[PDB]
Write a protein that binds this ligand. Sequence first.
Ligand SMILES: [Mg+2]
Ligand SMILES: [Mg+2]
Ligand SMILES: [Mg+2]
Ligand SMILES: [Mg+2]
Ligand SMILES: [Mg+2]
Ligand SMILES: [Mg+2]
Ligand SMILES: [Mg+2]
Ligand SMILES: [Mg+2]
Ligand SMILES: [Mg+2]
Ligand SMILES: [Mg+2]
Ligand SMILES: [Mg+2]
Ligand SMILES: [Mg+2]
Ligand SMILES: [Mg+2]
Ligand SMILES: [Mg+2]
Ligand SMILES: [Mg+2]
Ligand SMILES: [Mg+2]
Ligand SMILES: [Mg+2]
Ligand SMILES: [Mg+2]
Ligand SMILES: [Mg+2]
Ligand SMILES: [Mg+2]
Ligand SMILES: [Mg+2]
Ligand SMILES: [Mg+2]
Ligand SMILES: [Mg+2]
Ligand SMILES: [Mg+2]
Ligand SMILES: [Mg+2]
Ligand SMILES: [Mg+2]
Ligand SMILES: [Mg+2]
Ligand SMILES: [Mg+2]
Ligand SMILES: [Mg+2]
Ligand SMILES: [Mg+2]
Ligand SMILES: [Mg+2]
Ligand SMILES: [Mg+2]
Ligand SMILES: [Mg+2]
Ligand SMILES: [Mg+2]
Ligand SMILES: [Mg+2]
Ligand SMILES: [Mg+2]
Ligand SMILES: [Mg+2]
Lengths: 156, 80, 88, 199, 131, 134
Amino acid sequence: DLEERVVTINRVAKVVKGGRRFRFTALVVVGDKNGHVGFGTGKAQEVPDAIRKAVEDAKKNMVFVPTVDTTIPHTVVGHFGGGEILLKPASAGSGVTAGGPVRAVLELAGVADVSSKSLGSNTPINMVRATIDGIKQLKNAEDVAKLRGKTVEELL
Amino acid sequence: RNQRKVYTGRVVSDKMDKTITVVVETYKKHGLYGKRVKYSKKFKAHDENNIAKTGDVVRISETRPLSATKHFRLLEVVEE
Amino acid sequence: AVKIRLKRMGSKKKPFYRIVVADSRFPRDGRSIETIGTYNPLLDPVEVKIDEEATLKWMHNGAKPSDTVRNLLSREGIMEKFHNQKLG
Amino acid sequence: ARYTGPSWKVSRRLGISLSGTGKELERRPYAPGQHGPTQRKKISEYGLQQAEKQKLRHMYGLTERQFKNTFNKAGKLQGKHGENFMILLEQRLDNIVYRLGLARTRRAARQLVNHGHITVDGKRVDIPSYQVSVGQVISVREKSAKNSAIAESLEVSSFVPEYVTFDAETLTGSLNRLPERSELAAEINEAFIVEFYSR
Amino acid sequence: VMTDPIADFLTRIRNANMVKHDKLELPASKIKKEIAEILKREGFIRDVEYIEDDNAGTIRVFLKYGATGERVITGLKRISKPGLRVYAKSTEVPKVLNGLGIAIVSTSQGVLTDKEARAKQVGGEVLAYVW
Amino acid sequence: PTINQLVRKPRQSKIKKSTSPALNKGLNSFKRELTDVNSPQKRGVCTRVGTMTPKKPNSALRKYARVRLSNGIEVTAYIPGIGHNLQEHSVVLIRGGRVKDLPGVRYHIVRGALDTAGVENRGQSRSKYGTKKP
RNA sequence: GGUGCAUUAGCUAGUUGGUAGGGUAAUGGCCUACCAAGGCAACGAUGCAUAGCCGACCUGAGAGGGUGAUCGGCCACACUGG
RNA sequence: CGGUAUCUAACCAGAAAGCCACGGCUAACUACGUGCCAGCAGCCGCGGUAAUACGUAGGUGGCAAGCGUUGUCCGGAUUUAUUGGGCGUAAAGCGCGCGCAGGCGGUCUUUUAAGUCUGAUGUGAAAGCCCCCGGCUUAACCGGGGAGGGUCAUUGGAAACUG
Ligand SMILES: [Mg+2]
Ligand SMILES: [Mg+2]
Ligand SMILES: [Mg+2]
Ligand SMILES: [Mg+2]
Ligand SMILES: [Mg+2]
Ligand SMILES: [Mg+2]
Ligand SMILES: [Mg+2]
Ligand SMILES: [Mg+2]
Ligand SMILES: [Mg+2]
Ligand SMILES: [Mg+2]
Ligand SMILES: [Mg+2]
Ligand SMILES: [Mg+2]
Ligand SMILES: [Mg+2]
Ligand SMILES: [Mg+2]
Ligand SMILES: [Mg+2]
Ligand SMILES: [Mg+2]
Ligand SMILES: [Mg+2]
Ligand SMILES: [Mg+2]
Ligand SMILES: [Mg+2]
Ligand SMILES: [Mg+2]
Ligand SMILES: [Mg+2]
Ligand SMILES: [Mg+2]
Ligand SMILES: [Mg+2]
Ligand SMILES: [Mg+2]
Ligand SMILES: [Mg+2]
Ligand SMILES: [Mg+2]
Ligand SMILES: [Mg+2]
Ligand SMILES: [Mg+2]
Ligand SMILES: [Mg+2]
Ligand SMILES: [Mg+2]
Ligand SMILES: [Mg+2]
Ligand SMILES: [Mg+2]
Ligand SMILES: [Mg+2]
Ligand SMILES: [Mg+2]
Ligand SMILES: [Mg+2]
Ligand SMILES: [Mg+2]
Ligand SMILES: [Mg+2]
């Protein structure tokens, strides 16, 4: 059982001879607070039907976020097109400090204390892409030692 | 005994009597960017017997004002 | 003539004095040479903390306590030492 | 009593039953106003953060400016900022009197402290915002003593928290130790309070 | 012309990582020896060998990848460029990626990593960030 | 640019421009020279009262004034509220604020500060328009 | 060590150094006679415009940006010139 | 100062609540009047006989002895980008060359110690920010101790890197 959060609902149009036909596009972030999160996109003639398509789509982009002490292991920078996101660990109890669409991908992912800053564009779809582009770079300390052949206490 | 300050530079002009002009080259990092830059300001030294010649490398020590502008005296002539 | 004197600081009707060494010419709350101690008059047993070493050093260089200071130093008891080191 | 208005709608608007239960439920549990029964609407991120502030402010019943000041000095300690905020507020003399059972509500407790009816360490104190430490004794100092209002509220006191000690013969209350976050309110999201003040 | 031979060492490793090349070789130098030797100490590179020739010798480095082809080195950066040299005091030595990476510092006691520098209270020139 | 280029000539930032030039200027009658001091309000005597029409697509009739400020600058102000009592040769207080519809109007006349009086029968938002408690 | 303008390129003649003397609490073109022609400047002289300087204050994640009222230190001024 | 601060004795719920917003940004919506008029406005922009945007009511929301507007400064502004931007088509590579000054510079050994790192001494006043205690019934406020703050001066070391 996952949680839903509608980010943006936008009305788009294509021009056809007689006039204009309008459609609704919805962007939805889905995940459980344990560390899994994903996003999707839908399109329909009605707002309720656009969400349902986006929920099913979002269940195909699930990603895992590694966290230590309810905080990301280190500092990463996302990048996707014209949008980029800076994610930074923060002290316990500070809470999430994030912009509009980047809060959803962090509160749903279960991260409790993290600081961020959007250095790029403002488009909601490119902020979600640029954020997940940062979670990919995120590594745990346990796995780093495994690649480097060291042990955890030797690293730190 | 308290000690005055001694510098080291390169002679530039000897067209005046009893004195020489010495340029001292020094480094100083830029305030905001942090890059070392050349900085040269020339002094006046007292040449007691016109020993130093143009282009020499000398050492000069600080003294009481000998004139309107001179307040250094020549000490050594390291190179010619 | 450098002399040691009080310096008024604190709040309205709540004075607190800081024993300082300064010239007579300078303002009451201005330049000073150095600070020796404090003085609280509001405490019913008046409490004072003094260096007992910088005072004796200064009083052999031409420093004179004022009217209130002399009472403080006598009660604390270093003018006796100023007596004894003078003749000895 | 800084806010003298009806203390019944604030529970209905906030949605949490302040002072136990009954203010919100039983009666109309929806928000006050003309458009209470119908016309519901969604809440944005600003609304959710702002609504959390209003619960703490109106639960302990103190003004905005103090709330900001006590928040700032709460975060100067060592530990989690949100948890230290409720611990610091729990220290107030109003709350301790409320916790001991000498008053029924916080408004009653605040007036009781205000009109010099209590004493700490045998000295009269009239500041509601006085921060009680651990080990200090709080009493009544006779005078009012056997007062009908104070004696009536003693009977209707339900239970007493474990971090306060009080016996109803000398009325000598005391704070056993500094309280814990888990045993305070438990219906507030302190993470939203700290996020509200960082925008 | 060639103005920064150390930058070439840093960028040749990066260029070979993208295409998953299993080895590379490049002209040798004394300073490159420690940098290459340091990387072998923390497992960033799988091996290193020296080839002796007329001009300056030659060094080849064997890159390291995890099982199922994950990069071990995910980035290399030059800090103290010839155009703007940087120096760090004893307490100013950084922590690359919150201790999960390393920084190479050319102290007065030799070329050694950031972790070792803070154990001897010495500073120097920060050369590279490897994470 | 390169660090050496950035040292030979450093970075010069842009300069903002004030939108209320007349409010932040003074005058010295002894020297007949404008002095540079900021000020939140200025007073002056109005020389002409009238109306013009706003830009498209608005179509109302906006009531303005033409005031000569105490420092000797001729500006155009705007009277808010329903109905006024301004006439030529009247002393009024102006304060900052630009009206979008009007082309050249850049200031607002405050109501209730001087010869200009408050608005009649104002029940709410009374701090503006200067109407006292009824 | 802390400001704008190159749509402000040359500035200076007791100016630059020397010899003897005068004067001052004290060194010194500080002043005088003689002798020589030097000195500064694209690392910004000169000129125009603006400004008391600092500890500090406001803001800012920080690096920085703006200010220099009150309190403390230094300076200059006392209707305008000598 | 001054019969000032401060105590105890009694009577009174009695003398003590306003300011701004409610289309979005931004927490909070319904009636009536007007009918591109009166008017509103920081931006998008609302008003042309069913206006949650104009005016007034009822209700609500933010603060409270206040609350709003104006003026000035920093932030958001990575919108002068050292930290932290760019120049094919969006603003942005001189039409091209020869070259003084300046900036940068292949590999190794020995030495030096200007740059670089480090220890000691002197100093960077007091007040202010920050940390730890204490007094005013609490706080503001006031004391005691400490910390920080320099391309600073003298002196002793290290030799990898630049010179
Ligand atoms: Mg006494
Ligand atoms: Mg209005
Ligand atoms: Mg200077
Ligand atoms: Mg002479
Ligand atoms: Mg002269
Ligand atoms: Mg000049
Ligand atoms: Mg910033
Ligand atoms: Mg600063
Ligand atoms: Mg004044
Ligand atoms: Mg006069
Ligand atoms: Mg009396
Ligand atoms: Mg009493
Ligand atoms: Mg009564
Ligand atoms: Mg809303
Ligand atoms: Mg209508
Ligand atoms: Mg509105
Ligand atoms: Mg209205
Ligand atoms: Mg109303
Ligand atoms: Mg109200
Ligand atoms: Mg108040
Ligand atoms: Mg105000
Ligand atoms: Mg303003
Ligand atoms: Mg900026
Ligand atoms: Mg750009
Ligand atoms: Mg290019
Ligand atoms: Mg074009
Ligand atoms: Mg173009
Ligand atoms: Mg070309
Ligand atoms: Mg050259
Ligand atoms: Mg070299
Ligand atoms: Mg060179
Ligand atoms: Mg100090
Ligand atoms: Mg205390
Ligand atoms: Mg203090
Ligand atoms: Mg102190
Ligand atoms: Mg060597
Ligand atoms: Mg050596």
